[PDB]
């Protein structure tokens, strides 16, 4: 009669590393590294992301004619740009503090696009049909959906002054432009006044703009330039536009609502009717593991990104079938 003391063994092939020995075969172990995603863009807890597609933030907020399909979108869980998000500004120029604007939109969960300055009743003494081939739509010269190109009317450009009181109960993102003709002749045909200026002010914003006229290389075959600006108008405050030329006025503005967890990602993956708590530019993750080696960019509640190829914690013991 005998009785021996021994330990468990099985057919497991799971291997793990230790400080003294690499690739040790064990009986039980647990993977701590998530390396699987569904290769799709999904709703984040029921809410769909805003897909800019062929457009970028600039094209979207200015109202580039190429981004009309986006005009009706009011809420999203995160913003998605693609490698082909080329349509931004159509009339060459500089977008002042554009990166900061993108940062702002990054914490916006929703906004309401409204007419801050109705085209028909806002500018009685100025023409508002300014259009350009640089912003064409359907093969015809057009313009930004949210701005208005004001010009001389009947040989005259009276000094304009218009204001808007924010009674939306939220911050109102206001955008506008300043046109810079390539020569004094154009400045005159378009605005009459040779030495014009634009003034934009609020309780905490105050800037003056002077047309800088000069010949420049052609971009989208325009020698002219248009610079774009923006400011956040606090609830209850007033914004005042004053000009005697060169103002690319605000027509539509946005009443912003803030949220948390949003962000802007770049991806070439497609939107699907899927839901997740964790989205990466490559696909969504459904996991409880502490780490993931899928992607560093993350939207939601995800595992920590690490560069590791393998992270397995042994649970059982050294496996020695002894065959």
């Amino acid at each position: 009669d005998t009785i021996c003391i021994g330990y468990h063994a099985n057919n497991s092939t799971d291997t793990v590393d230790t400080v003294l020995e690499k690739n040790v075969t064990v009986t039980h172990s647990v993977n701590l590294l998530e390396d699987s995603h569904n290769g799709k863009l999904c709703r984040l807890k029921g809410i769909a992301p805003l897909q800019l597609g062929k457009c970028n933030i600039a094209g979207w907020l200015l109202g580039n004619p190429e981004c009309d399909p986006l005009l009706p979108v009011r809420s999203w869980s995160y913003i998605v740009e693609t490698p082909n998000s080329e349509n931004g500004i159509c009339y060459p120029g500089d977008f002042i503090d554009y990166e900061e604007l993108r940062e702002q939109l990054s914490s916006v969960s929703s906004f309401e696009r409204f007419e801050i300055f109705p085209k028909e009743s806002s500018w009685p003494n100025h023409n508002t049909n300014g259009v350009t081939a640089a912003c064409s739509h359907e093969g015809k010269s057009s313009f930004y959906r949210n701005l208005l190109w004001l010009t001389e009317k009947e040989g005259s450009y009276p000094k304009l002054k218009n204001s808007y009181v924010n009674k939306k109960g939220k911050e109102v993102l206001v955008l506008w432009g300043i046109h810079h003709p390539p020569n004094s002749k154009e400045q005159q045909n378009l605005y009459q006044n040779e030495n014009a200026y634009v003034s934009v002010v609020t309780s905490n914003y105050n800037r003056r703009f002077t047309p800088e006229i000069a010949e420049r290389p052609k971009v989208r075959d325009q020698a002219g330039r248009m610079n774009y600006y923006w400011t956040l108008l606090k609830p209850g405050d007033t914004i005042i536009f004053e000009a005697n030329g060169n103002l690319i006025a605000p027509m539509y503005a946005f009443a912003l609502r803030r949220g948390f967890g949003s962000g802007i990602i770049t991806s070439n993956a497609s939107m699907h009717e899927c839901n997740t708590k964790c989205q990466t530019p490559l696909g969504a993750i459904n996991s409880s593991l502490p780490y993931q080696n899928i992607h560093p960019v993350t939207i939601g509640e995800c595992p920590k990104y690490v560069r590791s190829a393998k992270l397995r914690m042994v649970t059982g013991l050294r496996n020695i079938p002894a065959r």
Partner: protein, 160 residues
């Protein structure tokens, strides 16, 4: 092994025992078979389960983290951002890999340790009523039946 049992004086494991990680073989005149020690196997499961849960719990969830844009005149800021992201990524990758490598070593020793203490725990009971053959086996002198083999498993026996 740090304690000498697993892959030590007890050459190998038993694919025959499937009730736990540590147990006995025993072959009385009534029959053979395998039996796992719940006491040990369970305590082992509690510790390791707690370990894995600690490792997981310390890595609380990663919330939204995305890239940022910088204009052409903010190369320094863009590189600073890049240093920050690569730096944190280097540290966490390092931390994750070391912790696992180190705790895996500890876990194996822990098992070696448990098998060791289980062996000595029985040896201290039997004492003279049997001899230590090999591979951690005990050849009884008085020959005890299955019902007796169980006294050894539950930790009683009584017969120095």
């Amino acid at each position: 092994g740090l304690f000498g049992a697993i892959a030590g004086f007890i050459e190998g494991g038993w694919t025959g025992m499937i009730d736990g990680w540590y147990g006995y073989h025993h072959q009385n005149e009534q029959g053979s078979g395998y039996a796992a020690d719940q006491k040990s196997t369970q305590n082992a499961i509690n510790g390791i389960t707690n370990k894995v849960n600690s490792v997981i719990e310390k890595m609380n969830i990663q919330f939204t983290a995305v890239g940022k844009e910088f204009n052409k005149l903010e190369k320094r800021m863009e590189n600073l951002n890049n240093k920050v992201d690569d730096g944190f990524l280097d540290i966490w990758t390092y931390n994750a890999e070391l912790l696992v490598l180190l705790e895996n070593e500890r876990t194996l020793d822990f098992h070696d340790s448990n098998v060791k203490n289980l062996y000595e725990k029985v040896k201290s009971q039997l004492k003279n009523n049997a001899k230590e053959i090999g591979n951690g086996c005990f050849e009884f002198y008085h020959k005890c039946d299955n019902e007796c083999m169980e006294s050894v498993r539950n930790g009683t026996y009584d017969y120095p």
